[PDB]
């Protein structure tokens, strides 16, 4: 049974038609919009990246934070340290959700080649709902230990929001967009 | 499917609730140190106490083995410690994955992809593995990494380290006093 | 103690016993090179023999494809291509190990990283088509070596049924310890 899940995910990830269907669904869930037609996975990654750049810049204004772009070496200025703390917290739960669904964190679609490539793919869909805003909220608060405050706040988001449980069907929905009968 | 997901939901329940997390961290402390965690200390405070005890243990080993030492830094001694702990982290990560848990959902260490690996490995690492690294560094051998690898294989085989890790993981999580899944 | 625990305990028994591990490594060598390793060689010595044969194979491939070659290492275009190809193969190899029910971190030739066994299994087959493909693409002087090589390697894995064929190879490699396989 776990083998069947892994073989399904790998099938999707290795077929260019199926990979694009999955990436299109990731885009659709991220933005609430059908993915633009006649665009490759690389083109969709570029469009997502320019929208994300714009989202960070708007959040910076909305929280009064000085900002030129996302940048980090865990370490950086306060805001970038906060964002890293928050997204790393989310990567942990996202990995648990991927494992819960029987899939491999390492086998991605938009991201590839790293231990958490599929984690990056999935976390990116939802990270702007509350996780990245919370990083900006903490940075603006400027508390004594901002990374710890981010961790505390994100653990509470995931506990209260049932993030893990909700991610599991989301991951299955993303893969089901390949239109291959799921396990 | 359902069983598989239930293990992860249990681990996350424990890790995301500040009260439950502290129960797990206090159990880890007691297993590691052979005495209870000080009362009225947060996980952050316990992490600092652990860190000071770890610095003291490295100091004591360096003094006993007669090895030059200026703290943990990620010459020969730090290379040997890294080789030894990497060996331990691999069998710990494998045990965690096989137990059905997520390596990234930790308790003392939180937010790196291997946080729970560090938590579990840290319970046992100073018993034999780190002392062995000192013994080998002190010999100043021609191939220290290989010597450390072979010694660590022998420690894990002779100590039944893997067979013990899986119940250890369950014992630690069970300290949250939530019903484990099937 | 359950099927997954049982498989891990089997793989770890093999990997931690110096005699069993050498039997496993000798099987890996035979599958890789199509002949038995020399008598009384240690794993370390066999790793060295593999290294020298690999150095020679890269040199031959460079000559055959007309690619400038200054050795294995962003680096030069050929090293970028080899790295993209082998990274792609690692992903499929990890999926195969996980599907077989075994641990990516518990290796035989390579030991001590989260992907040591992945590196062992990948090395058995990587010179069949994956590394030659890296040389073929490098010879085109691609502006996008990572993208082009991964496209090409996904097609190799899809068309060759690489993941499915790796599963029995992994099981056979472990079987060479002459310990009764699980269940
Ligand atoms: O546009 S900013 O000043 O809120
Ligand atoms: O220290 S080990 O050999 O039990």
For residue C19, the domain's CATH number is 1.20.120.920
Measured in angstroms, the CA of A139 and the nearest CA of chain B are apart by 18
CA distances from A178 to A20, B94, B159, C5 (A): 8, 31, 47, 33
Q: Is C94 annotated as a binding residue?
A: no
Burial class (CB in 10 A: 0-12, 13-18, 19+), A114: middle
Task: For residues C47 and A40, give the distance between their C-alpha atoms in angstroms, rounded to a whole number.
Answer: 41
Q: How many CB atoms lie within 10 A of CB C1?
A: 11
Task: For residues A109 and B101, give the distance between their C-alpha atoms in angstroms, rounded to a whole number.
Answer: 24
| Interface check C105 vs A, CB under 8 A | no
Å from CA of A59 to ligand 1 middle: 10
Task: For residues A95 and A163, give the distance between their C-alpha atoms in angstroms, rounded to a whole number.
Answer: 12
Nearest one of C181, C4, C9 to B3, comparing CA atoms: C4
Contact call for residues B92 and B121 (beta carbons, < 8 A): yes
Structural method: X-ray
Q: Which residue of A has its CA nearest to B116?
A: A92
B155 Cβ below 6 A of ligand 2: yes
Task: For residues C137 and C133, give the distance between their C-alpha atoms in angstroms, rounded to a whole number.
Answer: 6
Determine, for residues B95 and C8 on separate chains, whether the beta-carbon distance falls below 8 Å. yes
Nearest one of A35, A72, A45, A55 to A129, comparing CA atoms: A55
Q: Give long-range contacts, CB 8 A cutoff, 24+ apart: B6-9.
A: B6/B181, B6/B182, B7/B99, B7/B100, B7/B101, B7/B181, B8/A96, B8/A97, B8/A99, B8/A100, B8/A164, B8/B100, B8/B101, B8/B102, B8/B105, B9/A100, B9/A164, B9/A165, B9/B181
Q: Which helix or strand (DSSP H or E) is residue A99 part of?
A: helix A78-100
| Subunits close to B (at least 3 CB pairs below 8 A) | A, C
Domain around A136: 1-183
B160 Cβ below 6 A of ligand 2: no
B159 Cβ below 6 A of ligand 2: yes
Burial class (CB in 10 A: 0-12, 13-18, 19+), C175: middle
| Interface check A99 vs C, CB under 8 A | no
Task: For residues A38 and A48, give the distance between their C-alpha atoms in angstroms, rounded to a whole number.
Answer: 15
Binning chain C into helix, strand and coil, the percentages to the nearest 5 are 70, 0, 30
| Residues in chain C within 8 Å Cβ distance of A2 | 98-99, 101
Interacting residues of B70 by C-beta distance below 8 A, sequence separation 6+: none
Measured in angstroms, the CA of C97 and the nearest CA of chain B are apart by 12
Please, what is the angle between helix A163-176 and helix A16-31, to 10°? Answer: 140
B158 Cβ below 6 A of ligand 2: yes
| Interface check A37 vs B, CB under 8 A | no
Count how many domains chain B has: 1
Tell me if residue C2 falls in helix, strand or coil: coil
Q: Whose CA is nearest to atom 2 of ligand 2?
A: B155
Tell me if residue A65 falls in helix, strand or coil: coil
Contact call for residues A59 and A132 (beta carbons, < 8 A): yes
Interacting residues of B92 by C-beta distance below 8 A, sequence separation 6+: B117, B120, B121, B165
């Amino acid at each position: 049974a776990r083998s069947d899940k892994l073989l399904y995910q790998a099938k999707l990830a290795l077929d260019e038609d199926l990979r694009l269907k999955v990436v299109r669904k990731m885009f659709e869930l991220r933005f609430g919009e059908p993915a633009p037609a006649r665009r490759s996975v690389e083109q969709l990654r570029g469009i997502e990246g320019s929208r994300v750049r714009a989202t960070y810049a708007l959040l910076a204004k909305q929280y009064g934070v000085t900002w030129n772009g996302r940048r980090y070496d865990e370490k950086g200025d306060t805001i970038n340290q906060c964002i890293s703390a928050a997204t790393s917290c989310l990567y942990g739960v996202t990995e648990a959700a991927i494992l819960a669904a029987g899939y491999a964190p390492a086998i991605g679609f938009v991201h590839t080649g790293k231990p958490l490539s599929f984690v990056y793919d999935i976390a990116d869909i939802i990270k702007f709902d509350t996780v990245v805003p919370k990083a900006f909220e903490i940075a603006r608060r400027n508390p004594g230990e901002p990374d710890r405050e981010v961790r505390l706040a994100c653990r509470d988001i995931f506990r209260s929001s049932k993030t893990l449980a909700k991610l599991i069907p989301l991951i299955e929905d993303v893969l089901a967009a390949g239109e291959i009968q799921p396990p």
